[PDB]
Design a protein around this ligand. Structure first.
Ligand SMILES: O=c1[nH]c(=O)c2[nH+]cn([C@@H]3O[C@H](COP(=O)(O)O)[C@@H](O)[C@H]3O)c2[nH]1
Ligand SMILES: O=c1[nH]c(=O)c2[nH+]cn([C@@H]3O[C@H](COP(=O)(O)O)[C@@H](O)[C@H]3O)c2[nH]1
Ligand SMILES: [Mg+2]
Ligand SMILES: [Mg+2]
Lengths: 214, 216
């Protein structure tokens, strides 16, 4: 399970024998990424499994209902960067027995949510990264104003505390990284390297490597 | 994921996989290790099919010759939301193991959310879908992509094929698993979004089909 990190004949970063010429260094290997996400899953389960919110399964019941398959935790995943993080995370949530459903928002909102009944529900946002915090600050503001959830929290895979310049603080953080551009496991440069299993610091000379439009 | 899973039954007669009870399941179509074995082999099948192909160079618009599939001009993967995102997340990582450079864009059809990629003409495009049942949705999807963009090639990779349910004539080029003509749940498949995050694919109990009628 542990991934071997080294260097090849050239100066290139290697992980399990495969060379990553775009990488300056490794932020976290896949085994490290999944271990923290498994622990975050237990953290999320402990924080939500006993909570109660509005019963929309049985609308004739005025009492708050526990988090079950009938009234699951609402997870909002931020495309495109969070879909791999989200796919792994909700599987670990199932391992911890926390019922949840996922809808996607794409961000300026490009693709709106299709879920409509978030009022008085516990809602969790799954985002790939929090750097300056501007994106998630406005997203949290918009969801609070338009949907009025019972609670609204944010779970990020990577937090860059050194970059925060607005009043935003994610409740749940898997990994903490420096203020460098990272790629891999959802992170990309013009959509490249998104499917890599590890998170790397990108070489600065690769930052403008693909200027052409997709 | 590739660890052997034990299928059993608890004292209540409910399906269990690795000791975990699944009251909504009538039977098991494929456990997680079966799922991931077929995906890894399918990724090698995908890599062998696309590795040596060439398509139009959009990285360098000054170039006139066709270009190989590289980071500069990767394979274009269109993932169909919502059912395909878990399948897609695992698949593109297996494709990286095989060294097939690819980029993913999402489309949501009933079209509710359109592609943001705009340079698909003369490109090799692979649609990644959860399941092909009656085939009407994929048939209309393939025809829409062909007419609007005219890619160099357009093929469909589905996690599950239900060939016994065909209404129209549609054959996905790549099929990881086949299922009986039943309603399936788990690993992307759901009833009103429930059970999507399960690691195995089960046949749903008919009594669970209408279990969650309320709008999310
Ligand atoms: O590949 C990447 N490596 C990074 O280090 C990084 N930091 C920020 N982002 C992207 O910028 C968007 C805005 O994030 P903030 O509003 O929190 O600053 C984020 O939503 C991200 O999409 C990154 N993408
Ligand atoms: O949970 C599910 N279990 C199933 O057996 C099933 N069969 C079809 N579908 C869904 O129907 C949509 C259209 O597929 P077809 O046009 O091929 O029938 C597909 O895209 C699927 O979303 C299923 N969903
Ligand atoms: Mg249930
Ligand atoms: Mg579908």
């Amino acid at each position: 399970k542990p991934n071997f990190v080294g260097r090849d004949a050239d100066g290139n970063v290697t992980v399990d024998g495969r060379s990553y010429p775009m990488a300056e260094s490794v932020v976290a290997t896949e085994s490290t990424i999944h271990r923290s996400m498994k622990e975050m899953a237990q953290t999320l389960a402990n924080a939500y499994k006993t909570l109660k919110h509005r019963d929309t399964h049985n609308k004739g019941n005025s009492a708050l209902a526990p988090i079950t398959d009938e009234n699951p935790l609402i997870i909002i995943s931020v495309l495109k960067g969070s879909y791999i993080f989200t796919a792994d995370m909700v599987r670990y949530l199932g391992d911890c027995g926390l019922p949840n459903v996922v809808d996607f928002i794409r961000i300026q909102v490009l693709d709106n949510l299709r879920f409509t009944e978030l009022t008085g529900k516990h809602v969790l946002i799954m985002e790939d990264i929090a750097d300056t915090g501007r994106t998630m600050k406005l997203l949290v503001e918009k969801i609070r104003r338009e949907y009025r959830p019972a609670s609204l929290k944010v779970c990020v895979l990577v937090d860059k505390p050194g970059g925060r310049v607005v009043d935003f603080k994610p409740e749940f953080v898997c990994l903490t990284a420096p203020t460098r551009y990272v790629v891999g496991y959802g992170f990309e440069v013009n959509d490249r390297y998104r499917n890599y299993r590890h998170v790397f610091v990108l070489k600065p000379e690769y930052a403008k490597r693909y200027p052409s439009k997709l």
